[PDB]
Scaffold this motif. Structure first.
Motif, short mmCIF file in Angstrom:
data_model
loop_
_atom_site.label_atom_id
_atom_site.label_comp_id
_atom_site.label_asym_id
_atom_site.label_seq_id
_atom_site.Cartn_x
_atom_site.Cartn_y
_atom_site.Cartn_z
N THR A 166 74.33 59.48 139.12
CA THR A 166 74.41 58.30 138.27
C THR A 166 73.28 58.32 137.26
OG1 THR A 166 73.00 56.88 139.64
CG2 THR A 166 75.34 56.96 140.20
N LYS B 1 68.03 55.93 144.68
CA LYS B 1 67.77 57.06 143.80
C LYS B 1 69.06 57.38 143.05
CE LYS B 1 67.94 59.74 148.09
NZ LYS B 1 69.19 60.54 148.00
N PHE B 2 68.91 58.14 141.96
CA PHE B 2 70.03 58.35 141.04
C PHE B 2 71.13 59.23 141.63
CE2 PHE B 2 69.77 62.73 139.29
CZ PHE B 2 68.68 63.17 140.02
N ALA B 3 70.81 60.10 142.58
CA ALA B 3 71.78 61.03 143.14
C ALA B 3 71.76 60.94 144.66
CB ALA B 3 71.49 62.47 142.69
N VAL C 266 59.98 60.10 138.13
CA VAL C 266 61.26 59.80 138.75
C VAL C 266 62.37 59.78 137.71
CG1 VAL C 266 62.57 57.92 139.80
CG2 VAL C 266 60.40 58.64 140.81
N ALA D 26 64.09 63.08 136.24
CA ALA D 26 65.14 63.77 136.99
C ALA D 26 66.52 63.50 136.41
CB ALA D 26 65.09 63.36 138.46
N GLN D 27 66.71 62.36 135.76
CA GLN D 27 68.01 62.02 135.17
C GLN D 27 68.26 62.73 133.85
OE1 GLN D 27 68.98 57.73 135.28
NE2 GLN D 27 67.45 57.57 136.92
N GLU E 260 66.41 64.32 145.83
CA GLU E 260 67.12 64.78 144.64
C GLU E 260 66.25 64.67 143.39
OE1 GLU E 260 68.35 62.93 146.97
OE2 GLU E 260 70.29 63.74 147.61
N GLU E 261 65.32 63.71 143.37
CA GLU E 261 64.39 63.58 142.26
C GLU E 261 63.45 64.77 142.14
OE1 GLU E 261 62.65 60.05 143.71
OE2 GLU E 261 64.18 58.71 142.92
#
Lengths: 739, 739
Positions: free
Chosen positions: A231, A263-265, B148, B151-152, B167-168
């Motif tokens: 996301t 967290k995003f994933a 953080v 990572a996106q 995942e970050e």
């Protein structure tokens, strides 16, 4: 389904200006407007030749030799333009200009500002235009240049020159068949051939939702399914947004899982009960479940994004045989849900030379496979990648998809620039398609050190689809009983076909009135210029013979002489194709369990042509379609040649046992050759009886009943040449096929 | 030591402004000054949370649940600024701005001009600012953005999602444990966490001095040492500058070699006599020699540059065992100076969650290993790379260093951008550390086609450190005598540990007064919310059980019931950990020569936590530290279980033979079970006697004297459960450990 804030279509009427490409290609708006060209109305999605024919500037390329009259437009540029209203974009939101397909090399401008440079026909192109859009009326301009001329920006290696695929196709990412094949006309074309839309995204949005079947227990009705969710998530929304995952079937909720987004994933693993596995045709039900994931504000209930698709719980393994012919092409078998499946299906070629019309053909074309009862389809690397709807239909109807990466019969560059372009393409198509349960294999369509098929494509599958197998790769055309076919050692054959003359209706629509009859000046075996074009002659070369001569040679072998009458020739040619392809399928089904699959070429033409397809571009089914249908049944009683007679067998491509009775009679005389009950064990070939050798030529009829349903098959015995009128009588009195 | 023209520290007071990161990250000075934020004094080197706590804006994160209160600052930006006086720079000289550590993503400005963009926490960053410095007062500005949120900017492959590492952490070059582990809190942090200095370099300067041991003859006291020297050398200085190489020990000059510099890069090979080899603890002396190289003008005597370090003459070979379990993890042995060494040591984890405090802990932490008598340490890939001083101490004390590349339990990208970032990191750390004699192995810390660990890292070692081995890679937690441990086939185990409750002093400092007692509402086995946090709960999730339940389960197995009293529970938990870890070390030492090493987890906590470490963050030694000390001696008498009794053995991890006497008595009754002389052959396990089986439960005491020195050990016999007060009496009357 992906529910963005809004999606506004830009399909419809555009303005199209075209002109010959100068020595320096036009790449700016100012150059395009200043160029001397012709302006016409255009429809998006579309192909420039469709717009030009609508304006009365080109003749129907489907008819006669008209395909060659499009040659000058391969050196043209195409300037698309339209205006659009800016959608509402609030603070933090993103406005995305989405192209489903740009063919091919184009500079994209919004309000006079370049937003993208496209150079791949086969994948989507998305551009963030949030900062260049203005309130009110906006301008969209796309300046396409000549794909043929782009090939001269590259220096080819030795093995990229002289292959069947065009040298023009080697350095560019376009469907290789658009340059001309033996089953597709040369029609390079250009245009915005898929949807153009404007998308508004929230700051919180779903980037990717990757559904993976970890395990399945069909008998316990359980499955372990993983969701790999990525996301976009502003940090202020961390711990304030929840993911809502819902599995359902027919509106009935199977499972609902909510999880706070920290967290995003994230990886979510759902252990499901009361769910059925997805099976290909014959082996079970193509059970699909609606899988929805939403990002929801925990306080306000605002739904920031929602992604929905239909998934199927299934596993796939490619079991390779290294005992008999280790490492050879076709020495493998597919294992679906732990069960060895026998694959039977067709190769999938372009639905149309003008690929913007592909989507309008998808439903009827897939329906041909459903009527055929194919459980597999191989998407040929000479074609574009089909869109999502094609895979949704294969999901729904239980047809496994073997997907080639878009490469043709040729060798490709080992250098960095081509590898980077292919890696971008592979990542895009893998991410787009990897969630369809019907898709079961990726193929490089390719000595063993080729960087492209052994490094670039394998690395993408390794990182982005480790749950699916990847395969680097995959007399003649005389008598279909030649040892070339009957002694072929391949367990799994993927390209086998036989030529067949199309139905008269199609012939009269394809050719000029004076060219409908194939024999120029009346001499049989001598094709006129229009039939030479429709054999698929890529370039306008005046010659005699070639591919078309296959039709007359097979007719000579089976029936002795080529009929001068056209309708007699159609029946003779279609009867040869029908018997040949039926024999191949019966041969591979009859030699299980060593044989593991047969993918034949092919179910449907992509253009009005003379080809080995069993149905033509306009839906005309050749005789082979009905013969093939009778040997594609789940349980099929068939006859194979034996050493001292004929072996009557029954093949079962299901997981169930069946009982029935079978009767075999000589058609001409009516004598009962065999009659008795049989037991067809599940997922195997079973021998019923060895039939005694018959005298001379003739046809055996096979009548069998299973669970109160009547099925029919036949066996043509003896050695050619046959009398065409005797074969016609045998078929007619057999009572299965119309003549 | 590197003697540049001058080195001026920029450590000390800075100005720190912090604010929430906007949707568009701030990257310019103008944006940072215009942003609405809070300004505080800051100390460099430092972490932003230390500065914020000094200003009274955050509570002590070491206490209770305060660690979760730092969550909002993960989405913050950090603007460092200070002024500095320009150092003197004459013509031809270079002014270098040196950062020992930037955490992490930052734009660096000098006098308003961008000089660098940092994006790797783990390596140095040097910027040539010769042309942007101005005379007088200069401005230094560093604008850090949220790690953080970075990572996106990346799309993750499937296998990068759902691992134990965040995942970050997957797409960025930061210490994976900063995002939270089971032995380290989540504390992403940020800051200038190592030294910031200004260096002036001459036009003639040493770029790299790479010392390599070509050969060593310890008994002949000789060694062949190579110096791979790279310099910056203006051509007018060619043939006018000499290299002066000096080897010395304790001020006494061993060798001096001068050589005219005729090219910028040279190999010098020094054949030394009267020099001793470097050995790890137990196998010999950690002999170090000062190696200095200077570039000196032949005419004026001007010293342009000088590089000095302490080197050790030693060779290392990683002998892999391919006869028993070929290719398995741990089927190898280290060969140092041609001798097979048995490795015994600890895994090295972060010294502090706020890594700017790492350097202040290095001396005391290394001293723990010296007291323990570890001869090896494995620097865990979840941590940062330690600085030069840590390796100098390992050089000095004879502790071999096994260095993981900074990667955690997860899979990483196969794509070009990540490989280029990792290659830059690997080259930097290899060049920085390759001259330390203690460093003996590089490890990828990683199926076999993973590009990162099998191509990128191996290529860097191939080119930049070919003298050191590179390794791609490296019931349960129930009864320590479970077959899971006693039948483990690994010759070399690298991750083995047992949980242990910290000392009461540490408990009372960690928790709130009402949370010091672990049982919430008094019910044993039920941990309160603060103990759940200190089990190391990464995200604030209210639940019961989990990691903390390991402590109570092991106590139940050994002692039958969990003591309600806190001090009794500490003694019981610490006694279980002590007996378990002592048994593991005695098991691997007792099964030489097949077993080749044991690296246990771990000697020291990096944060006040409940963990398997044998000493806590504040230096509190658990009972296991003293048990372990008694089985880490150079020569150790120990007891292993035997088929029909107990086997009394002596292990020797030295190159010398030893004689002594050993006495074994039952503690409770006092009966002498065995007494006799033994001969401990060098570098091997030796069997002394098979002791007869004892009756019931009890403890054997082992007293042995070697060269006039008394040593002690014990063996707990019988089968659990034991009575805790009976075990306490056995220990007390045993007379070895305080209770």
């Amino acid at each position: 389904s992906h529910m963005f804030v809004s999606e506004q279509s830009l399909n419809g009427r555009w303005t199209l200006k075209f002109f010959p490409q100068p020595a320096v290609p036009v790449m700016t708006i100012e150059g395009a407007e200043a160029a001397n060209g012709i302006v016409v109305d255009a429809v998006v999605p579309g192909n420039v030749e469709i717009d030009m024919e609508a304006a009365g500037l080109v003749e129907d390329p489907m008819v006669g030799n008209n395909i060659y009259k499009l040659r000058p437009y391969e050196g043209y540029q195409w300037y698309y333009s339209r205006t659009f209203a800016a959608p509402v974009v609030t603070e933090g939101q993103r406005l995305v200009l989405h192209f489903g397909g740009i063919d091919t090399f184009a500079e994209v401008y919004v309000n006079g500002i370049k937003v993208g440079s496209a150079d791949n026909m086969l994948i989507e192109h998305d551009y963030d235009i949030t900062s260049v859009v203005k309130e009110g009326e906006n301008r969209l301009d796309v300046i396409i240049r000549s794909s043929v001329m782009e090939a001269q920006n590259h220096f080819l290696g030795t093995l990229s020159i002289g292959n069947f695929s065009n040298e023009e196709s080697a350095p560019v990412r376009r469907a290789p068949s658009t340059y001309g094949w033996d089953i597709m006309p040369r029609l390079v074309s250009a245009g915005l051939w898929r949807d153009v839309t404007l998308r508004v995204e929230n700051p919180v949005t779903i980037v990717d939702a990757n559904w993976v079947t970890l395990s399945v227990n069909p008998k316990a009705r359980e499955a372990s399914e993983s969701l790999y969710l990525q996301t976009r998530l502003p940090f202020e929304m961390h711990d304030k947004v929840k993911a809502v995952i819902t599995i359902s079937r027919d509106g009935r909720q199977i499972l609902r899982k909510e999880a706070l987004m920290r967290k995003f994933a994230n990886l979510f693993t759902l252990n499901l009960s009361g769910v059925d596995a997805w099976w290909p045709r014959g082996y079970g039900e193509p059970a699909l479940y609606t899988a929805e994931v939403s990002l929801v504000d925990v306080t306000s209930g605002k739904i920031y994004d929602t992604k929905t698709s239909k998934i199927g719980f299934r596993t796939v393994k490619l079991e390779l045989d290294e005992v008999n012919l280790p490492g050879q092409p076709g020495q493998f078998q597919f294992i679906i849900n732990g069960e060895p499946v026998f694959a039977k299906g067709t190769n999938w070629v372009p639905l149309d030379a003008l690929h913007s019309r592909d989507a309008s053909h998808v439903e009827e074309a897939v329906q041909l496979m459903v009527e055929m009862n194919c459980n597999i389809v191989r998407c040929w690397g000479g074609n574009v990648y089909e869109d999502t709807h094609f895979f949704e239909l294969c999901d729904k109807y239980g047809i496994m998809v073997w997907q080639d990466f878009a490469m043709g019969c040729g060798n490709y560059s080992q250098r960095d620039n081509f590898a980077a372009a292919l890696e971008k393409e592979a990542i895009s198509v893998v991410v787009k398609l990897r969630n369809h349960p019907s898709l079961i294999l990726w193929s490089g369509n390719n000595p063993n050190n080729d960087r492209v098929s052994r490094q670039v494509l394998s690395r993408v599958i390794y990182e982005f689809d480790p749950t699916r197998p990847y395969l680097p790769s995959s007399g003649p055309r005389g008598y279909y009983k030649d040892p070339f076919y009957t002694e072929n050692p391949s367990q799994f054959v993927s390209e086998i076909g036989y030529h067949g003359c199309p139905n008269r209706e199609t012939l009269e629509r394809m050719f000029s009135p004076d060219s409908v009859n194939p024999w120029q000046n009346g001499v049989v075996g001598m094709w006129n210029d229009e039939w030479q074009t429709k054999a698929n002659r890529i370039y306008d070369d005046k010659f005699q013979g070639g591919r078309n001569d296959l039709m007359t040679n097979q007719v000579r072998i089976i029936f002795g002489e080529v009929p001068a009458d056209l309708d007699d020739f159609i029946f003779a040619s279609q009867s040869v194709q029908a018997e040949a392809m039926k024999f191949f399928v019966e041969l591979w089904r009859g030699r299980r369990p060593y044989r593991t699959g047969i993918i034949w070429w092919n179910i449907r033409d992509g253009w009005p042509l003379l080809s080995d397809a069993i149905s033509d571009y306009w839906g005309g089914k050749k005789q082979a379609f009905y013969y093939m249908q009778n040997v594609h049944h789940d349980v099929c009683c068939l006859i194979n040649p034996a050493a001292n007679g004929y072996m009557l067998k029954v093949d079962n491509n299901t997981l169930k046992d069946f009982e029935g009775v079978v009767e075999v009679k000589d058609v001409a005389s009516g004598k009962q050759v065999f009659k008795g009950k049989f037991v067809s064990k599940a997922n195997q070939m079973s021998e019923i009886a060895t039939l005694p050798m018959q005298k001379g030529q003739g046809m055996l009829v096979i009548s069998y009943r299973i669970e109160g349903n009547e099925y029919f098959n036949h066996y043509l015995y003896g050695e050619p040449p046959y009398k065409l009128d005797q074969y016609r009588k045998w078929v007619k009195k057999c009572g299965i096929y119309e003549l």
